Structures are given as C-alpha cells and as structure tokens.
Ligand binder design. Sequence first.
Ligand SMILES: [Mg+2]
Ligand SMILES: [Mg+2]
Ligand SMILES: [Mg+2]
Ligand SMILES: [Mg+2]
Ligand SMILES: [Mg+2]
Ligand SMILES: [Mg+2]
Ligand SMILES: [Mg+2]
Ligand SMILES: [Mg+2]
Ligand SMILES: [Mg+2]
Ligand SMILES: [Mg+2]
Ligand SMILES: [Mg+2]
Ligand SMILES: [Mg+2]
Ligand SMILES: [Mg+2]
Ligand SMILES: [Mg+2]
Ligand SMILES: [Mg+2]
Ligand SMILES: [Mg+2]
Ligand SMILES: [Mg+2]
Ligand SMILES: [Mg+2]
Ligand SMILES: [Mg+2]
Ligand SMILES: [Mg+2]
Ligand SMILES: [Mg+2]
Ligand SMILES: [Mg+2]
Ligand SMILES: [Mg+2]
Ligand SMILES: [Mg+2]
Ligand SMILES: [Mg+2]
Ligand SMILES: [Mg+2]
Ligand SMILES: [Mg+2]
Ligand SMILES: [Mg+2]
Ligand SMILES: [Mg+2]
Ligand SMILES: [Mg+2]
Ligand SMILES: [Mg+2]
Ligand SMILES: [Mg+2]
Ligand SMILES: [Mg+2]
Ligand SMILES: [Mg+2]
Ligand SMILES: [Mg+2]
Ligand SMILES: [Mg+2]
Ligand SMILES: [Mg+2]
Ligand SMILES: [Mg+2]
Ligand SMILES: [Mg+2]
Ligand SMILES: [Mg+2]
Ligand SMILES: [Mg+2]
Ligand SMILES: [Mg+2]
Ligand SMILES: [Mg+2]
Lengths: 150, 145, 129
Amino acid sequence: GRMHSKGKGMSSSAIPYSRNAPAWFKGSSDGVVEQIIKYARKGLTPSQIGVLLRDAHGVTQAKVITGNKILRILKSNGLAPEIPEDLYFLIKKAVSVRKHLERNRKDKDAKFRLILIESRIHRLARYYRTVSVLPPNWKYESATASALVN
Amino acid sequence: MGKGKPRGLNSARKLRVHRRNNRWAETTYKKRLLGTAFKSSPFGGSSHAKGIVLEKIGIESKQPNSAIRKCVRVQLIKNGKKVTAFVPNDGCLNFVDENDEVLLAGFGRKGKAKGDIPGVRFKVVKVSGVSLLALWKEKKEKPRS
Amino acid sequence: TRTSVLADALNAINNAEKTGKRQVLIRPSSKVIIKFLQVMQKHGYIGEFEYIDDHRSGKIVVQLNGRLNKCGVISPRFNVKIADVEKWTANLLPARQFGYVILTTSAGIMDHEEAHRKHVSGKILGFVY
RNA sequence: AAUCUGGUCAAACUUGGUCAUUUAGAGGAACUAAAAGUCGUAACAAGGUUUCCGUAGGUGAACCUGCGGAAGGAUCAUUA
RNA sequence: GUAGGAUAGUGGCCUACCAUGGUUUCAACGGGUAACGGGGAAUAAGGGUUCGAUUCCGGAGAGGGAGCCUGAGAAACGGCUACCACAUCCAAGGAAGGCAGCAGGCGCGCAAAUUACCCAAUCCUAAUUCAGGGAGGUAGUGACAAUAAAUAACGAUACAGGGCCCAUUCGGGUCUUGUAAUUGGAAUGAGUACAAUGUAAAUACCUUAACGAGGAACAACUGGAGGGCAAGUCUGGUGCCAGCAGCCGCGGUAAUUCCAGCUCCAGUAGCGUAUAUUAAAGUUGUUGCAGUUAAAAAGCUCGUAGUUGAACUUUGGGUCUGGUUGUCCGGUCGGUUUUUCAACCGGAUCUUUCCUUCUGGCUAACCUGUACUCCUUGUGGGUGCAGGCGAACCAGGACUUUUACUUUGAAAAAAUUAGAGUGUUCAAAGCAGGCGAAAGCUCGAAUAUAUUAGCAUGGAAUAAUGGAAUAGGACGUUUGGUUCUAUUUUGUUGGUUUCUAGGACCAUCGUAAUGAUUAAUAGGGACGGUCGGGGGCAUCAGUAUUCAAUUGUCAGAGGUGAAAUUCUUGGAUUUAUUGAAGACUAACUACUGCGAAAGCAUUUGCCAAGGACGUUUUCAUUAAUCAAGAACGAAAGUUAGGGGAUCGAAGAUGAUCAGAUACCGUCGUAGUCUUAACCAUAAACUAUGCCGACUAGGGAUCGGGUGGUGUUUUUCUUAUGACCCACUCGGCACCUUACGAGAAAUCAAAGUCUUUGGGUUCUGGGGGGAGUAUGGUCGCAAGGCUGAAACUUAAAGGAAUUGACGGAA
Ligand SMILES: [Mg+2]
Ligand SMILES: [Mg+2]
Ligand SMILES: [Mg+2]
Ligand SMILES: [Mg+2]
Ligand SMILES: [Mg+2]
Ligand SMILES: [Mg+2]
Ligand SMILES: [Mg+2]
Ligand SMILES: [Mg+2]
Ligand SMILES: [Mg+2]
Ligand SMILES: [Mg+2]
Ligand SMILES: [Mg+2]
Ligand SMILES: [Mg+2]
Ligand SMILES: [Mg+2]
Ligand SMILES: [Mg+2]
Ligand SMILES: [Mg+2]
Ligand SMILES: [Mg+2]
Ligand SMILES: [Mg+2]
Ligand SMILES: [Mg+2]
Ligand SMILES: [Mg+2]
Ligand SMILES: [Mg+2]
Ligand SMILES: [Mg+2]
Ligand SMILES: [Mg+2]
Ligand SMILES: [Mg+2]
Ligand SMILES: [Mg+2]
Ligand SMILES: [Mg+2]
Ligand SMILES: [Mg+2]
Ligand SMILES: [Mg+2]
Ligand SMILES: [Mg+2]
Ligand SMILES: [Mg+2]
Ligand SMILES: [Mg+2]
Ligand SMILES: [Mg+2]
Ligand SMILES: [Mg+2]
Ligand SMILES: [Mg+2]
Ligand SMILES: [Mg+2]
Ligand SMILES: [Mg+2]
Ligand SMILES: [Mg+2]
Ligand SMILES: [Mg+2]
Ligand SMILES: [Mg+2]
Ligand SMILES: [Mg+2]
Ligand SMILES: [Mg+2]
Ligand SMILES: [Mg+2]
Ligand SMILES: [Mg+2]
Ligand SMILES: [Mg+2]
C-alpha cells in the first residue's frame, strides 16, 4: 500500500481481456518496432515511447501487437540505457534534493525526503544487482551519483 | 492480527530467544538462575540451619491481632549471619533458654514473613538436640541442662 | 503483502458462512485452493465452484451449502510425521469420528484419512469441522 | 655407576601487576516495618487556585509557579 | 603455505622462511554455573518443565601443579623424582609420607552405617584345576525408597433395633440384626524354642514339635475437629493474654480456631513439618496469554540482518490387471473356497505423452514361420532355428539442477520405559520354568519405542532453487576444420604419418511451433491535470501592545474576587498624528485540510518534494515488517547572539486566616519570541504497532473523476466556472442489533479466538522497593538511553452497582 507514504491508493491502469490484437487497430508490428527505435534514438524513455504510441497512433500495447514489450525490443536493437529509466529518474531526484539541501542548510523535511529517495535508489540498485543488469560492487549514492547522472 | 510472535516455519531461534528473555520476568526462575538463595537468604539455600541463641526477644505483632510473639535472635553457625526465629506453642521460649544451640527451619512462605510476626522468617525446631513440639507435649523429656 | 492466498480465501469463506451467504467470491484462486475446494466437495461441505479466467491470476466463486462450520488453515505448513497426524487431528477436529485435516503430500492434496489409507503424509494446509 | 656440557619440559619461589569472588570497615545517605508522636492539608467533591505530564526555578513540608502539552475535565452543545 | 624436525603415525604438534589470514549479531570472544557428558529420573491428556554426585557406558583425578622410569599399554600415584601446601618418626646427624579403595576417626555440617564374616557364588590376575581378591558376596546398623498385610473371629445366653402370623389392648418374637468387665467353646503368629532346613560357616527366611490372649492386654500412632477442607455452635480453664493460624483469620468475660477430657474426623505402620521442584500455571503461552482503559504499542518515520511473501507450467478420460475385507451359501469336519457382488489400495498401459540414455553382455519370450502337424471333423497342443520384439537381469560409461519435506528400511549397547509369557502362596519382582517311564523328553528367554544428525529407498504435492533473450542455446545425414589421445596389429624397441575410434574447441548446413508465463485492485518509476494552514528561503498586512517625540485638555487614572494596596498631575491617563524595535500572525476557523510524527493558518514569490487521482504507459518480485544502526523531534533548559510589549518560575509585596514566603492582588530578572548550537524527553495519547484480507445498514463531509437536452451565468449557440442529482474511488467522522467482542465502559473494530495457526516488529508477567543502586554509554550541563537485587507486603489495580457525599447543575 505504497512503499514510503501512508497513502494506500489504487490509482491504476486497468488492462483489457484480449491478449490478442484489438482487430481493426491496424499498422504493422515491424513498423511499430521501428518507431520505438527512432524514439529511443531521439531520447524518449521506454515508458514515454509507449505513451506516445498510445496517444496519437493506434497502438494499445507493444506486448499485444509485436509480442515483445518495449525495453526488450530496445535491448535487442541496442538502445536501452546503461542505467534503467526509473532508477535514473530516482538518482536525478536524489541529486536535486542534495542540491536543494546544499543551497538551504536548514531544511528538515527536505532532508528526510532526500534520505527516503536515497533509500529507494539503494533498494532498486540492489534489485538490479540481484537480477544482473547493473554490475556488482557498485553503490549509486551521492558524490559519484551526480557524475553517474551526467 | 498475526499476534506478535513470528509464525514462520524457520522462525524458531528467534522464538527461543524471546522466550529466554521473557524468562527473566518470572521471579522464581530468576532466583533459580542467579543463586539468590546461595548468595543471600541467611540459610545456604537449605531446609534447615543450626544457630546459637544470642537472646530471647519478644516482638510486637503486626496489626489486627495485637501481642508479643516470643522470638529469638539467632546467629547461624555456618555463615555467621544473624536472624530472628519465632518460637511456637505455649511457653517454648523458656524451654529454649539462652546461648543454646537451636536448629531452625523456614517458616513456610519460601522466605518472607509469616502472617503477623513482622521481620521474622524461622521456626525454632530443635533446642540443643530435642524438638520443641515434643518438649511442649512432654512425650519426650529434655536431656537436663 | 498478500501472504497465504489460500488462507485468505478460507477466511473469506468462513466469514461468508458466518453471515449466512449462499456463495462466496474469491480473488486470487490458486492450485492449492482449487484442490482444497475439490476435497471439500468430495467430503460434502460445498456446492458448485467455478474458476473465472481473469486473463491474469484467477477469480473463484464457491457455492456454500450451509454445511461448513469452520474451514480452517494452519499457519506455517508444518512437517507431519504420520504419528503426529493423530495429535494434529485431536488438536483441531471435534470428535474422533468426523471432520478432516487437509494436508498436502507427495501423492497430492488430500484429507488425513485419505493420507492414512495411502500410507503417505506430508505438510498440513487446513481443516473442515 | 657417580660425575658432568648444552637443551627441554617445567613445578615452585621472589617481587611486582591484574581480574574475579569474598570480607572487616569509622562515617555517610537511604529504604522498609510498626497502632495510638509534631507541623502543615498536597490529592480525592470545580477537595475549596480543576487534575496530570514534560520541563526549568524556588521553597519547610507537602508543594508552589513559568512554559508547552494533555483530559483520566469541571464541556462529546450556540446555532445564522 | 613450503620445507624440515619430531611422533607409532595425521597434523602449527614444533622449527625455519613467506603470505595475511581466521572467527563473528546464523552471537565470535568474554563472564557465570551451588555444570563432569549421556543412558536415564520426577512429574505426566497433547506440548512440556525441572533433575541427572550416584549400580551401565564414556571422560577426567588420586593434597596441588610439574617431570619421568619400567613396560605391549601409565605421563600410573595402594611406582618413582622434585617444588609448594600439609603433616609424621627421631639419639638432631637424618628417615619416611598421600583413604576421592574398604572399615573407622576427626573435621565440617540440616545431612549419611560395622575398624564384622568369607571366597561357596559372581567374575577377575598369574608360572596358573590348586593361590589370591575390602572387586564381589555374607550378615551387622538401616522407617532412603518399594511390595505384601496381624492388631481378634464364631458362638451361645442377657438388653435393644428390623421383617411381622394377627395389629378385640397386649403379645409370642415363630424369622433376622446390633449391644453387655457376660461366658464358651474353635484357631492365630507376633513372640519363644528342640529339631530339620538354609549357609563357605552362620544368621534370617520358608518347615515344624512344645509354650504361648481376653481387656490389666500378645495395648496404633500421627495429625486435625469455623472456613478453604473430612469432622464439635460440647464442657471448663483463658479473656488482645498465652497462644493457633500456609491463607482467611480467631483472642478484648457467652472463644465451636488457644489450653485439657469425651466424643469425632482423616490417613494408617505410617503421618506430620521444612526447603526445593513438577502439576495445578493458558501466572512464560509452539500447541496456548495479554498490551483503548487492569502490567504492556518504541513520540514518529527510515532501515541491514532476520522472519515472511500474489497467481502460472501434466490436467483430465479409457483399457486391462494384482490384491482386501464385508457379502452369497457354509461348497464344509467352531473353522475353510468360489461365485452374484462391493468399496478400498495398487500395477501396467493408451491417450499430441517417456520412466535417464547408450556401449555391450542372455535377447526370457514368441511379433515370428523354418518341416507343419503328435492329432475329437479344430488354430486345443510343441520337437524347432537364419532376420529379430530386450526390461528377465547385469557391468560399464555418460552426466546428473540442487535442496528442504515426507516413505519404508538399515543402524539409535544393556538396565530403565512400554510390553508378551509364566502361580515369587499374592504382589513389588524374577527369567524363569514345564512334562515323563516320572529310566528321559521339553517350551522359553519375545515384540515396541527412542523421532535431533548421518546412511538407504520410494514419493514428486507443498516451499525454495535452477535453465535458451549479445542464444557463445539445443540436437545431427552436418560439411570443413582446429587441438588432440592412442591401443591395436606392421618381429621388438625409438620414431613419423596413417586408417581409425574416443576427448575437447571455433565454422557453416540443416532440424524444430526454435527460446521471455502472468503483468498480482503487489511494488517502484515516467506521464497527465490537480490539491493542500505540508517544509525551506523572501516579503506584506492587521497591527497590537510599549517607550519616546510633537498634540491637546487640570484630578485623579491603574488594579480588585468579593475588597483593598499600588501611580500622577510640574494633565500621568485620556485625545490625536507618527517613529523605533523585535514579537505574533485573530476575524477567517468547521466533528474543515495537509504533513513520517513533532507540527503546520496574512502576502506574494521563489525552491524542491508529496499523497490522492487518472493511465489500453513502463520495469518484472524490486515486496511486508524489522534487533545494528539512522532521520526528525513540542515545550522548557542549556551555551552563544538579538530583543524584550504584555503576561511572567524567580523575587518583591497587599490583604486573608490560629498561621499562608499560597491562591487573589499589585509589580516583574529568566525567558517567553526570535537567530546559531544542543538536548532527545511528554497524558509526543486515538492512553488503540504495522501490512493484509474479509464480514451491516446510512448519510453527509474534504480530494479526484464519470454521466446527466438538469439549472444559472449571457457576450447571441456558448465554452470555462458554480452548483443540483447518481455513481465512483479517497482521509482527519452517527443508529440498531449483535449472531462477532468484550470484565464492562463500549467496539463495525477493540470482530472473523478453547470452532484456538494471514504476515511481522516491539512490549508486559502481584504490588512496592525503583526508573532507584551499580556499572556501561550518551551529553556543556540539567538529564537521557540502559537497568538490579536485598528487603518488604496481601492486596495494587481495573471496570462498573448501590449508596453517602460535593463551597457541581
Ligand atoms: Mg491497496
Ligand atoms: Mg516500510
Ligand atoms: Mg485489632
Ligand atoms: Mg637443566
Ligand atoms: Mg475553583
Ligand atoms: Mg487540598
Ligand atoms: Mg486542587
Ligand atoms: Mg516558592
Ligand atoms: Mg609435515
Ligand atoms: Mg547437569
Ligand atoms: Mg563442578
Ligand atoms: Mg552422571
Ligand atoms: Mg558437587
Ligand atoms: Mg563411571
Ligand atoms: Mg583428601
Ligand atoms: Mg601423578
Ligand atoms: Mg590409597
Ligand atoms: Mg590404581
Ligand atoms: Mg573410606
Ligand atoms: Mg538420612
Ligand atoms: Mg565394595
Ligand atoms: Mg535395625
Ligand atoms: Mg502376620
Ligand atoms: Mg489424637
Ligand atoms: Mg489443634
Ligand atoms: Mg480443640
Ligand atoms: Mg465442614
Ligand atoms: Mg468455651
Ligand atoms: Mg510451572
Ligand atoms: Mg496473563
Ligand atoms: Mg497501560
Ligand atoms: Mg506510549
Ligand atoms: Mg516515552
Ligand atoms: Mg506461491
Ligand atoms: Mg512394566
Ligand atoms: Mg514596560
Ligand atoms: Mg482548508
Ligand atoms: Mg489571517
Ligand atoms: Mg533502534
Ligand atoms: Mg526553546
Ligand atoms: Mg503573579
Ligand atoms: Mg504578604
Ligand atoms: Mg514487580
């Protein structure tokens, strides 16, 4: 019921019944893949790409039409970033928080938030390590965090 | 509610530890462990102790019932500690006399007071090798002085 | 987290029974759960039950007969060494005569009597009396 | 064979050092018991300044009084 | 580690040289043990808890510590050598010692036996039938513990209870029971005692002759006699005494509780007391407790270990075939063998299905058909061997995803425990016994437990683990290769290269359905519009108070709790404009909103973050809670800076009361407020841990989001906005019954708990002593975290009920 806050909501995407294609909504799988690749090249993250596909074009999910997801496709092509997207975002957030703290020494809530973010990042990092995406003996923290980010 | 204690199939050591920890709230258990009887408790965690009658002392009783309870200040032989032993039945204190050896027993309450006699923990049983009850009865006689 | 899905289901069923409902809706719907349900049916504690295919995990509906009294689930799946089975039964079930102690084992998810017959016990799941 | 040169095992001793457990111990400062001591009446009734809590400071003793908090409050109440 | 040395040998066992390891919150290390380990013991529903010096197995030790001889085996102590500690013998020069063997003594202590008899048994040692044996047995003492049970029995007569032939009143009493120092016959062994038994010799037992029972004995004690708890409102003595009393309590001139008699109870050769301990104690809780208020939820969030963790991969049907008890008759000489039937447990298979696969041995078998027939008209039946079904077994590869779980098995010394058999006279026991001609024969000395770990095998549910996503993947008629290795024959050695058969490793060709489960009303992250008294930094208001300035007006204004003090008049106050300062941020303001809590309400801005939502977005187990540690954290206090208006601990001071440094009163340093450091506590309280699920109605209410030809805005249709209504998800919130609960107040959770088990953390175990002592540790301190015991005490609490009461209404 949420990781960090005490807010237990279900703001959530439903997903339709048919694993098979929504008949009429046409195009091609290959075309979709190409589009995704292009997006990746441009700079759009997998989620972003998916959103784009949903909004203007007739795509519902890549999982449906291609068979494969988006991240997987990117990997196959050679386009998934070194740091996975969510993790990267988290890191960025942490960095921002750190910066804010530096700017304004006296700020307790902010500090707490930063700490929380860091913890989250650590968790994520650990998970990644367990999986085998990010190589082991590697902490994504604070001083080098900035460097990692940019 | 899962109710406090871990119900996992591999949560056994933790449970044991918890139990152990709890054990130190139970008083008897604690006593058994630390050797409070062996380190204190005038007697050496024993049933009885022979002791020398230092003097006859009438002690004033607690409350409700009001009386003087004909106790004896006894010095235990083995340790050297000084205690106060109540002396049972009518008279009895006369029989006990003064400077006699006196075999004490616990009063009943695993230490502690015995009803109304405040600061008193022991029955005199034998005086100089007889038995107080017996003396009272006059079934057996005293071995002179 | 949603720990012991089966347990949750059982609890729900119990609640329904207490209420006086004629049927229950169950979310997660496992293999184990299904097995349990089947066992119950065999015994004679439950009507129809139907697995909805949410194109996903599962979702069961159970027809209650009004016969169930408790449909319990013991917590960690304790390792039962055949002789201990009797003890377990004594602990859980009312009467030597009737009721069951649904326990998974090598052979399959079965009641206690069945296990005895087989000559094969294992880890407990639940009970029905 | 005594005797004997180097080792080695090393008791013990001497004088120190150290940890544990005991144990004298002038004085101190406590607590407990007991039925009838002394000065208060703190709390309990809005207990006659409502109680507490934290915290400072004071006092002969309860205790007082700041500050913040709590009602186990002496109010589940004032509509427009 | 390497090498040596040593040792019977392995080995940092020791030496040399080098390396820097090794163990640890899955509690290393240290400390304690009134700890030798285990078999086992006590208790005894199940789970347990405590004890185990002690008859068996191990291990240690011989006053302590050391060293060694001899020897197969000792670091022996009924061997030696030393030193320490203790001690003996002495002619003082010197000698000898070691009971934790047995006996015995002291000593200590609450606490434990004879300086006895013997090798007959049991076994042991040697040069060994033969000796020895305080090992061992035999008695002695012995109320440790355990078993078995005497302490009158039957009469008669004599006085009363009960059946009654009949009850005109009786009564015989024809029938049966209890009471009397009557009395009488019949035993008895406890004692004694010839004998004989036993026995190494004795005792004692069992066996006997003889004597030995009549209340005076051949004599039962202990505790109790209000309750708990079986049994005295008996009598006297006592009179808060003396005493009993585990606890409750009894005692104060009417004691059923003290002290005596009688009665009487309980247990009985035992019964009491003391301490432990087990049960009872679900008052240590895994089974199986509590934490809103009774003791108990860390103030809050973070968080490593730990503990746990959504669903998804082989399901279903047939076809035979082994049993195993009920049935159908006993088909039978109370027992047995099939069928009509059954459920139940297997086995083989076939179902898109491999159970590990082959290199070979044995291919049992016929899938066979080579001659076709011993022969009822036959597919009833088998002498029979080239192709060849291999499961009928081996004996070797190849390499196993690995566990946990459970199965049966093999091992868990005997004694113990459970337990079968059996006349120790019975039993506690014991391993004995039992039957003949009673010339010889003959049953026994079982079985089961112990679940920790290891071994063995079957099972594949549950739970984990693993694999093909740069496929460096799988196979194989690949076709090249590369590195091999290498034995077998070329006479036998040393080659070199082959044919070849087995490794291994890069190519390329083919084969296949070629390879990712879901995407948890789990979680993270992007996106979208939003929301907010959420935080930081920055400004704006009200101001409001105060001092001061200038301004005006001449007796008081402040203050009062009823009342007073207290201040100015050379207008203080009051009236009016300002200024400075640092405060705060009303009204708005609610059963309203946000924040992890603490906490947060004027302005705008800036700075990031956040929940809810919406989402056909994306990752795929990242998840839940947490001892180590971390982040915050009201107020006060603190150090150090700014200010200080008022209130305002300290202090002055004015009343009141027996008094009152207390309220009330007036004043008012520290602060209060702020800024830089700390501190880390609260009735940080919802006195309610978190996550999860489910159970009963209702309206609202905040924040999102849907639909309404709804209404109004009105700039004509509008389109935003703002409502109305319905549903929707979301946090700070009523009524009834509770069947759910709860001791009850109450609770829709404090429910789904003796019908006890969703996942976790933490806390509590009568009250006090005490949040103390001590040590740690943390601090500038104040204090914080951590945290005792001795000793004490029968209640401390909670909730409510009726009262009584209240300067409450
Ligand atoms: Mg949720
Ligand atoms: Mg968390
Ligand atoms: Mg009295
Ligand atoms: Mg030397
Ligand atoms: Mg008042
Ligand atoms: Mg008072
Ligand atoms: Mg008061
Ligand atoms: Mg004062
Ligand atoms: Mg070596
Ligand atoms: Mg022991
Ligand atoms: Mg010892
Ligand atoms: Mg032992
Ligand atoms: Mg000892
Ligand atoms: Mg031994
Ligand atoms: Mg000795
Ligand atoms: Mg020795
Ligand atoms: Mg000796
Ligand atoms: Mg010896
Ligand atoms: Mg001896
Ligand atoms: Mg004795
Ligand atoms: Mg002996
Ligand atoms: Mg004797
Ligand atoms: Mg007899
Ligand atoms: Mg008597
Ligand atoms: Mg008595
Ligand atoms: Mg009496
Ligand atoms: Mg009675
Ligand atoms: Mg009387
Ligand atoms: Mg107990
Ligand atoms: Mg309790
Ligand atoms: Mg409490
Ligand atoms: Mg609390
Ligand atoms: Mg606290
Ligand atoms: Mg699962
Ligand atoms: Mg037995
Ligand atoms: Mg002033
Ligand atoms: Mg609001
Ligand atoms: Mg305002
Ligand atoms: Mg902590
Ligand atoms: Mg402050
Ligand atoms: Mg004042
Ligand atoms: Mg005064
Ligand atoms: Mg206590």
